[PDB]
């Protein structure tokens with residue numbers, strides 16, 4: 548877990564689709580300006596699939612670890628064709644940064 552390291556991990560992994568505040572547009576992932584308490588499906592001005600829509604719980608680091616290790620294991624019928632990430636540190640490092648972004 549580290550905000551500094553995580554700063555450049557999110558984007559290199561997956562900025563092309565997604566934003567944490569600004570600049571990045573609704574291409575193929577919503578701007579994650581509020582996680583960690585905010586819900587699953589209910590993206591601000593975006594067009595998710597009904598698969599994510601059906602999911603109706605809090606996003607949180609707990610849920611994200613599962614989702615980042617393997618999103619297919621949680622919401623597979625979802626447009627996010629994301630492959631995979633480190634394994635076990637990831638869910639701390641990426642999360643370390645995003646827990647900064649959506650929050651301070």
Ligand code: HEC
Pocket residue numbers: 557560561563564565575576577586587588589590594595596597598599600606615624625626627628629632641
């Ligand atoms: C473009 C090919 C993507 C990449 C690369 C990543 N994501 Fe993504 N994500 C994408 C879409 C189209 C969606 C919605 C799925 C649907 O049903 O249409 C998502 C969704 C998420 C969510 C959920 C947000 C919500 O509205 O509930 C999260 C938390 C998320 N994605 C995070 C995330 C991260 C951190 C990624 C890299 C590590 C990543 N995504 C890659 C498309 C794409």
